[PDB]
Amino acid sequence: SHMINAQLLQSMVDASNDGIVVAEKEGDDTILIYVNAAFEYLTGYSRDEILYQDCRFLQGDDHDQLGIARIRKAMAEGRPCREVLRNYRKDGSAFWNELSITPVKSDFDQRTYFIGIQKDVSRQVELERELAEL
Amino acid sequence: MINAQLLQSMVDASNDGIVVAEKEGDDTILIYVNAAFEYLTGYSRDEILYQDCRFLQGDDHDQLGIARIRKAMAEGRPCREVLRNYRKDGSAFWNELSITPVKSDFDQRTYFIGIQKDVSRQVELERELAELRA
Ligand SMILES: Cc1cc2nc3c(=O)[nH]c(=O)nc-3n(C[C@H](O)[C@H](O)[C@H](O)COP(=O)(O)O)c2cc1C
Ligand SMILES: Cc1cc2nc3c(=O)[nH]c(=O)nc-3n(C[C@H](O)[C@H](O)[C@H](O)COP(=O)(O)O)c2cc1C
């Protein structure tokens, strides 16, 4: 009587300020099958551009970031993980992405999907460094 | 095809508190809260459901943002305000609150999505850094 319906679930995901994505594993890729508006705003990429691609384009030229090894191992072991990564928007600007990945098993196909949540921590990091200097 | 199970998992994974409230008269009472909201406020889902979120203001009221929230809600505008809020144990924190009115043709009920996050540290840093800058 008083409880939410499924359209409300979509509304909560749409209202989120952090990016929220769903990806599915294929071989060495985990390809984006859903992104919310905040992900497009945060990354500068449109939904049409980046769907069915692995999120690693957000690392740009940066690789062998330690968090990436931790993510790969957590993915292999079926465990959730959280890493702060250097990421880059479509225009090339850098941001610090606090990224969480949660595997969830879909009852429909009994397939494991991966929920990402991207939070821009750049301002908090830079301000922490500035105050450390001060 | 993102089903309701996956949408729910996306809400459950959110770092930020996420709630749904429905308006009855001058109350908007909580009909859903996620785990991040419970951890942020220290209240369990069973304690706070079907109550207006204003209990989080505690002894405080007449904060300027509250007046802005009221006007924005009456006008159906989304809004964002940083409010002083209080946990179950009484501890104070700065809550960046984003309220989004839900537009739905399906049911007559008017709903609001709240998104809450603890900005206390960023506020502390901002004031300290501004003072030291002088
Ligand atoms: C659901 C999901 C979301 C992801 N989001 C990001 C992201 O926003 N930024 C990023 O740098 N990596 C993200 N990744 C990690 C990469 O997609 C990839 O798994 C990681 O770089 C390790 O794979 P690789 O060594 O083959 O590049 C995400 C991974 C998953 C599964
Ligand atoms: C969906 C939603 C979530 C809200 N969350 C909070 C909150 O977390 N903390 C808070 O102090 N007020 C929150 N509010 C605002 C109060 O519920 C209330 O609308 C505000 O105090 C102004 O109403 P009032 O002047 O009648 O007290 C929320 C409102 C809505 C609609």
TrEMBL record, chain B:
Statement: the UniProt record of this protein carries the keyword GTP-binding: no
MF (Gene Ontology): nucleotide binding
Binding-site list for FMN 1: D52, C53, R54, Q57, H61, I66, R70, N85, N95, Q116
Keyword line: Chromophore, Flavoprotein, FMN, Nucleotide-binding
Classification via InterPro entries: PAC, PAS, PAS-assoc_C, PAS-like_dom_sf
Residues that hold FMN 2 according to the record: D52, N85, N95
Domain PAC, first and last residues per copy: 77-131
UniProt-listed PROSITE patterns: PAC, PAS
Ranges where the PAS domain occurs: 3-76
Designated name of the protein: Sensory box protein
Source species: Pseudomonas putida (strain ATCC 47054 / DSM 6125 / CFBP 8728 / NCIMB 11950 / KT2440)
